[PDB]
């Protein structure tokens, strides 16, 4: 009974760790009256600077590709976006509707400026970054040109957010 409840808590915490906006009821309110450094959060969807004429495509997704580089995988069902990088990079996931399980992707043809998941806390400003197999950004085979604007910021044991601008492909 009690052990079952504890296991339920652990599983719920582990599952909600990989969630954009997990629903956690709190016993008391939090104080965030200061207006600085409130943007570094896992639920901060979209980008820091967004243009009216940006191209957004919604696709079914497998796994959790939120704030990660995505590739197209074709299976019978329609093709789906999966968290991955390398030479297969098609775009980056900037939003996810979990009810419909639909991920929104900005194509690599468009330029983006915003926070993305990093491999670890070894990223500094003015660094060249590459998307790994898991869709995470790692310090430098850079087929694309992405530069880090800030340092790696830690929210959880594996949640590392870094402000990066991606502006196409190299040659």
């Amino acid at each position: 009974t009690t052990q079952l409840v504890k296991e339920y808590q652990e599983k719920r915490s582990k599952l909600e760790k990989f969630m954009k906006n997990p629903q956690h009821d709190a016993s008391l309110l939090s104080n965030s009256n200061e207006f600085r450094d409130k943007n570094v959060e896992f639920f901060a969807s979209g980008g820091t600077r967004t243009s009216k004429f940006d191209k957004l495509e919604n696709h079914p997704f497998l796994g959790y590709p939120y704030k990660r580089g995505v590739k197209r995988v074709i299976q019978h069902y329609e093709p789906h976006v999966e968290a991955g990088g390398g030479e297969d990079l098609y775009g980056i996931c900037i939003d996810i509707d979990e009810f419909s399980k639909t991920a929104t992707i900005v194509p690599i043809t468009n330029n983006f400026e915003g926070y993305l998941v990093a491999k670890d806390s070894t990223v500094k400003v003015k660094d060249k970054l590459i998307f790994n197999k898991d869709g995470a950004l790692e310090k430098v085979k850079a087929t694309i040109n992405a530069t880090a604007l800030t340092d790696a910021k830690q929210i959880s044991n594996e949640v590392y957010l870094v402000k990066v601008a991606v502006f196409g492909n190299k040659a």
Binding site: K55, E57, R72, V73, I74, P107, I108, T109, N169, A171
Partner: protein
């Protein structure tokens, strides 16, 4: 060789079924179209419809035109032609595109969804280096020498 068949038809069309009624050569544009897409038009040399285009320069008296081509000279993808004015609608290579494009009549059976594609000298897609194109379906044969395929083009690669 035309957006609309030159020869007329002796038969009315049966508008009953709703499935697989889009694999026609007259289907212009892209299957999924963004309202924020950049659309250009140019004078057309030849018939570059449903083909990759490149810039063509004459002596200098007349302006530049677009001709079916690819390789290192790929400028975009032609998605529409107005025959009366000879204006070819071209979507730049810097803009994402998803639609039906001409496929090379060689190994068309070997084309499967998820296969990397590149443009040839005649603006025809072929299975593979410098252009990011992925086939989303299999080759559909509309004529003994005409093959189309659903492909997505999302810019050049390194």
């Amino acid at each position: 060789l035309m957006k609309n068949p030159q020869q007329d038809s002796g038969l009315l069309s049966n508008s009953i079924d709703f499935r697989d009624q889009n694999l026609i050569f007259s289907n212009s544009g892209g299957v999924c179209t963004s309202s924020k897409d950049k659309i250009e038009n140019y004078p057309a040399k030849g018939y570059p419809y449903k083909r990759g285009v490149k810039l063509s320069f004459g002596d200098g008296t007349t302006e530049l035109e677009v001709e079916a081509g690819g390789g290192d000279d790929l400028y975009g993808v032609c998605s529409d032609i107005d025959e009366f004015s000879g204006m070819a609608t071209v979507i730049p290579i810097t803009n994402n595109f998803t639609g039906y494009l001409t496929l090379k009549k060689d190994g068309q059976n070997g084309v499967n969804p998820g296969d990397k594609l590149n443009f040839n000298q005649h603006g025809e897609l072929e299975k593979v280096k410098s252009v990011n194109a992925i086939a989303l379906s299999k080759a559909h044969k509309l004529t003994e020498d005409l093959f189309i395929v659903l492909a997505s083009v999302f810019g050049n690669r390194a």
